[PDB]
Amino acid sequence: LQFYRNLGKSGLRVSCLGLGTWVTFGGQITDEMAEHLMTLAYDNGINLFDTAEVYAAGKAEVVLGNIIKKKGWRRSSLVITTKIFWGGKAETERGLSRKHIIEGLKASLERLQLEYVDVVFANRPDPNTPMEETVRAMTHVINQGMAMYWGTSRWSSMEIMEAYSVARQFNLIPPICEQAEYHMFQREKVEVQLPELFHKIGVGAMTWSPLACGIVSGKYDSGIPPYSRASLKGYQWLKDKILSEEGRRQQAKLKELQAIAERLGCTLPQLAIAWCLRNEGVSSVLLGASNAEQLMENIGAIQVLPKLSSSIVHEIDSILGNKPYS
């Protein structure tokens, strides 16, 4: 019921809901729409906006930056985060080496027209770079004032713990957050592995794709709608997943969850999002939206949160039948 939460155990306060920019910004939607989305989010108290060097080859960062500059919002009232890993076709333009982290962040900041991001993330783990180099590089950009904090994304708890111990060993700065995928059909990591890290070393979770790219919205109950993400060019993988075997099983279960939604008095998306926020270990949930209607509806998930009683959660687990073993 607390709109603002600490990101993990750091002093950074984020809105329990955030707005991301994958697919949409500089891609699927227009710059005017992106501006409309950010304005709605900001005006509704959302202070968390996520992007990445890889989104639309850097265009998502340019669009986000133009809106921030145009709207003139105080930088201190925003929490901007960007992820680093894939930054070019050249061999040295990808990974978590000191070279790419510094060059990647510097280029992202130039596109964003910002002096710094609040949190810079390693978009994924790098088997090819010693943890020490990565932790030292993250620490370096923070000491240079290019970022306030850093975090991991798609890292195992083993790898996150490693980054933490290497930080203590060399007196560096530990990551404060892991950006993990989380929704009714992807629960293992966040529910079974991240909670220990949150209590032990204060690492919080900032989860993405709460509606599994739209799958959990319910819009695909009877085929691929026109203008939906699964229909978009380049997202054949998403369409395949939805039409597959497992795909139909999910849509079947979504129809059962629909009853839970009505008993709670909310829409399916509002329930799927509120559900992600039931665990204290989840600091914030990054939302995706192709238009203003979706955002306005989704933000309503906050009213559902208080209704998620033990009974309701246990019922949802019965329907999903995928509760991870502890």
Place this chain on the structure above:
Amino acid sequence: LQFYRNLGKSGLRVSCLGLGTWVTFGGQITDEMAEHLMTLAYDNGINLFDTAEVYAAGKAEVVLGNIIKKKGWRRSSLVITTKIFWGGKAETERGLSRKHIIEGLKASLERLQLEYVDVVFANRPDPNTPMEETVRAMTHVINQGMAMYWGTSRWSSMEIMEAYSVARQFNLIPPICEQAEYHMFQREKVEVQLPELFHKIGVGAMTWSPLACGIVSGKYDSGIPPYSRASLKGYQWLKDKILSEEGRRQQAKLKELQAIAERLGCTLPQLAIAWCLRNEGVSSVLLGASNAEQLMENIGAIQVLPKLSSSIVHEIDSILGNKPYS
């Protein structure tokens, strides 16, 4: 009797009396008067001036900065201090997180038109930010040349000690001072808890409101005078305190102290201020003044200091009847 004192055990030398800017600068008094006050103070050897991002929403810092720039005083002859905590209505614009400390100080410095302050203070403790983050952030702005030293304000000795041990653990910079309230009717913290810290870890005290906002001046012995702080719009809380039960008891005792003042040959304000300076643990006392007369009178407290004999102090304790238990 030593006009200049080390702030705690650091090498920073401050005048035993300093001039603050709460309420007055950019608020109650005019910019011309503020300039007159600073000039009198400076010309009388006072090198310590205190302000805060929260005072008059940043206007106190703008006024102080304009005077320093206009008078052209050498920056090396001044000891400017500013406090950080409340910097805006946004969720991320308050607290002692790394984000707000850096953004807060940077904005204060911009308003002050200074490259750095000599001491930056945490205006109060932050239950929501890990001590490590706070100590690392204070250390960061010092290494960036934005501040020379840092200190705490309204922190318990437990919290100050924590900041100190976290600093030693990570090889960071320990706070050198605590800005605590201190006057004849608020003595517990400074007389009972801070002395151990001063001898053990060198933390000195820079006390504020030596006249309890004017209450100890004696001007309220018979009601709320026109143009006094208690009469000002927004200070109803102060008026209430003065007219309350405890309020009359204090004024009653002030009348008894009046006799002590005459035996010593000084005014009541001069005695109340000199009294705050009797303990070696108090490095300096921050004065408040709405006009030049008050400042000229108050600075005279320094001549009273040598007269505060054991006998006189014990008599003052008898009248106050609030000497804290050790």
Place this chain on the structure above:
Amino acid sequence: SERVVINISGLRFETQLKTLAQFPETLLGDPKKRMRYFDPLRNEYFFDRNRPSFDAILYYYQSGGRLRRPVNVPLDIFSEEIRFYELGEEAMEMFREDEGYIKEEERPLPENEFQRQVWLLF
């Protein structure tokens, strides 16, 4: 082979996580049980306890079973430690046999009410 640091009243010990995980039911072997003693600022577990004893407690894990009391540590003190680290009654009983003890058996009263009343004063 994640390393684990255990600080006993200042005395520093290190071992591998898999070494402690060898005995899942003990205090140091169970993540939920040791969680309480972890210090995230120093990346170590801290116990405000008897130093001389711990050398043996850790060796118990390293040797995969051997629980010998240090010659210089009183039996009463060491036993208290064994119970604190929750090594379990099986290893404790096994510990007492080697420390010279065992036995402690023998049925009680008859249980026949009156038969168990005469079997008392005789």
Place this chain on the structure above:
Amino acid sequence: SERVVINISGLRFETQLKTLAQFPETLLGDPKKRMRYFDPLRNEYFFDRNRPSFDAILYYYQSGGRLRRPVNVPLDIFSEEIRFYELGEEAMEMFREDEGYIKEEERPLPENEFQRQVWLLF
């Protein structure tokens, strides 16, 4: 649960403040008494003393009373330490009983002047 570090001639010991505060009248239990040994540069108390003994001194606080002399430490040396840390005569006397001693009683001369003069050569 503020932690406290005590450095004995290089040997590092740590405990909780509340553990020492358990015995307010001792040297390490009284803030005013230990103040003299604090090192603000290292955040620790330093004592240029006998190392083998301190293990027992600290355990005395941790165990809430048990004052056993280490088997490898001479009784004369250990007793000097007990007195330095000011554990008090109650625990010292209690320490000597266990270390095998006690007694040391028996009235003196008669006190009757002359009666106490004959009671000498007889």
